[PDB]
Each structure stands twice: as C-alpha cells, then as structure tokens.
C-alpha cells in the first residue's frame, strides 16, 4: 500500500532551486536533481551536482544540444560511461554551452544505471516516488498558465502530452482532496512555491508528466 | 560477448515484406508493427502484416504522437497495450495519411504485454537484444544525401549524427568484407538499397545514432 502523500525534502534528499537562466538545461537540471538524491541515500551527503557539466559533456553523441535541449535518460547514460559527475561547487553553472571541464579529481557522483518508466503510468510514478526517490520528468511547460503559476495545484485545460521541459518529481499528496505531484522547477527560487510547483495528479497524465520518467541508480 | 556473429531474422520467417509510407512521416509506426510482427511469429508461428494506419490513426495525442507528422515506436506500443490490440495491415490498410480512428477488434492480429528500451548507444546490448529477442525498433540519421542513394554494402557517412530522425527496424547484423554492419529494414519500398533493406555501419561509435534509441515489445503467454 503507497502512502498518501510523499516529500523527499522532508528527507534530506533535495538540494536548494536553482535558475536555469536564458540556457534551456532543464533536462541537466532535471537528470542531476534525481542523481541529487541517489547520492545523498548512498553516502548521507547533499550535494548539488554540476548541471554544467552534462551541458559541456554530454552533448552530440547523446543526442543533446546543451542550452538548446536534450534528454535526462542520455545524461544519466553520460555519468555511466564517463565513470562521473564533477560538483556543482567545482563546476558551477553559466547558462552558456562550453567545451567540456570534466576532470574525475572533482568527481562527486557516479551512475551504475537508470531506469525509464512505462509510458503514461500515474500510479507506476507514485510508487517509484514512493520506493525508489525523485523521477526525472518532462512536462508541457509551453502554456502562459505555467510562466504565471504562483500557488496551489496546477491544472491548464489546454495542456497536452507534448512534453518540452525536464523537471524533478520530489514528491506527490492532494491538497483539500485536489491530488497533485511535488515538482521541483529550475526557474529560481521566486517561481510558483519558492521554486516549486504542485501539477495535477490522476488527472490523464496531465501536461504529460507520466509521458517519460526516468531514475538513476548508484552501486552499492 | 557470448552472442551468434551474425543474425537475419528473415531465415526465420519474422519479417513481413518491405512497405513504402510514401509522403506520410509513420517511419515510427512502420518500425514498431515491424517488431511486433516479428515476436506475433516467434509466440504463433503466423507471419502478419500489422497496421501502420492503425497507430497514425489511433495512436496520437495521447501517446505524444502526431501520425504522418512523426513519432514514437515506445508510445506505439503503449497504445497497443492500453487499447488490448492491433488491426491487421489487411483489415485496416496504410493510406499514407491522417484518418479518424477506425480500430475494430474484430480484425485483431496482435497484442502487446510490454516493451523495453535499451540503454542509450551501447551497440554490445543491442546485438545481444537482435540475437536473443527478435527485431529491435531503432532511429536513425537518414537526414544525409548519402542516405537516399544507398544502393549496396555497408552504410558509413562520415557526417552522420546522433540526431535520429527516421524509425527503422534492425532485423539483424553481421560482417561483409571485413565491415560489421547492421541490417535495417527501411519503409520506402523495395525501391530502396537492397531491396528495401540497408546495411549500416556497426561498431562505429553509435553511427547514425542507430543505437541511440531501441526498443521491441513482447506478447506475454496469458
Ligand atoms: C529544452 N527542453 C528540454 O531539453 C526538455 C526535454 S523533456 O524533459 O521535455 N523530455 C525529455 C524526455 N523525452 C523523451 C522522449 C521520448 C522518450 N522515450 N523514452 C524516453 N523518452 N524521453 C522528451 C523530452
Ligand atoms: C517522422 N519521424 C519519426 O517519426 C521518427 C522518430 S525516431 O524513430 O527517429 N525516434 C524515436 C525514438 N525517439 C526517442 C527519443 C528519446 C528517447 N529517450 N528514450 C527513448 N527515446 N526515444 C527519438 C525519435
């Protein structure tokens, strides 16, 4: 049986919003926030990892165009093959497409596998937020409802399985009945609930948030 | 490692003739009835066409899919799974556009219990996939003037990408003259390569991204 409602901050396992900037790296964002809380289960530390470094690394031959978009599943298969993830603190963020600065001596994390859900799957979603941690998600981000979002559980009449912009799933619970997913965004801190917003749940697969979810593992 | 060294799943009897989608973007349905078909024959002992038309028509904004404007071979068969079944090529033929939904489960030739995506660009996990599963749904880099007018051997284009536009279904892999290739099935008629088919590079750091993006379905026992 899943519990009712799910927070992974209440745990420990999720790292202060940050803001993407004019650099569409949500999928970086998206990919290190999952692996975020995978490191913090496995070594007890919370630690931001670098997002730049998969928008300078993980590029061309994973099928991603850094601040013009790309995929948290060929991010994670990036961490696997490159035998790391640089910190966040020794590789931080510019919102720009550089030449790759990987360098394993500031290794933070590492990725043994990931794990792609079952396409539209709401309640397969609740029990891997439940069991497993935050999921990697796409959403339809493309509605003016979503840039004026400020507080309670989004629902945009207009949004469709189209999914354009990668997010972390942190949690999930209903507010007075309304039952919605914990969504941690990467447009700052003053977007929606200081950074996060709560999108509609068992709502069919609304903005297309079950469309495509992914987690990473660690080894051990 | 331990896998056969080559593969052609037509000495099997599980492919189905060569289509042509003509001037209508469903290379994506193509690539997953070309899979399904594949594992119909392997759990029934009946080669089938299955409906493209069926998932253009069928499979659409729901499943992220926008029929002759492209789409998903993962997604394809998610439909195929929620909706319990797929029409026949025969009952529900191809006509190269996008029609209003016609699925009737009295033409039903095929299920669907699951599918899996193979991990990104690892080429060792897909010839273990092709030798062991049946026809893998692959995209590929088909976006280069080399593509079109390929006519013999094994496809390599210096220029190709990761940047997959293009469903395809690998029916197998093997070597011709010292070259390690993959064997594709296209969906542009016997017209193209040879006879529909393409021979594409393999072991070639994920050449044309053709391991970029796999999956095949599987039809369960009940
Ligand atoms: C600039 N914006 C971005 O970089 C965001 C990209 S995304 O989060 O919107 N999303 C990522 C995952 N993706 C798929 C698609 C098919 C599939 N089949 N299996 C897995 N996937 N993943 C769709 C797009
Ligand atoms: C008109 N053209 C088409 O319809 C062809 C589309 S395709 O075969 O080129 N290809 C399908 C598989 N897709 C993904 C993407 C991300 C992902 N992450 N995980 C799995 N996927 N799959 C990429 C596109």
């Known amino acids: 049986i899943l519990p009712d409602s799910v927070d992974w901050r209440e745990k ?9 900037g004019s650099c569409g ?31 300078d690394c993980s590029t061309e031959k994973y099928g991603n165009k850094g601040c013009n978009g790309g995929f948290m599943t060929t991010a994670f298969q990036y961490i696997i093959d490159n035998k790391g993830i640089d910190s966040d603190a020794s590789y931080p963020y510019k919102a720009m497409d ?27 979603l609740k029990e891997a937020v439940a069991n497993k941690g935050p999921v990697s998600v796409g959403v339809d981000a493309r509605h003016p409802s979503f840039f004026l979002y400020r507080s309670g559980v989004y629902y945009e009449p207009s949004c469709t399985q189209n999914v354009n912009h990668g997010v972390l ?19 700052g801190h003053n977007f929606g609930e200081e950074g996060y917003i709560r999108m509609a749940r068992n709502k069919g697969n609304h903005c297309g948030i079950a469309s495509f979810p992914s987690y990473p593992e660690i080894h051990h």
């Open 98 to 124: 550089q030449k790759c600065q990987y360098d394993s001596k500031y290794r933070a994390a590492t990725c043994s596998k990931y794990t792609e859900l079952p396409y539209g799957r709401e309640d397969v």
């Open 12 to 20: 420990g396992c999720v790292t202060e919003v940050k803001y993407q």
């Open 169 to 187: 799933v942190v949690g999930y619970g209903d507010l007075n009945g309304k039952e919605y997913w914990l969504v941690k965004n990467s447009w």
């Open 25 to 55: 790296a949500c999928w970086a964002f998206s990919a290190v926030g999952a692996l975020e809380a995978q490191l913090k289960l496995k070594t007890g530390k919370l630690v931001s990892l670098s997002a730049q470094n998969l928008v």
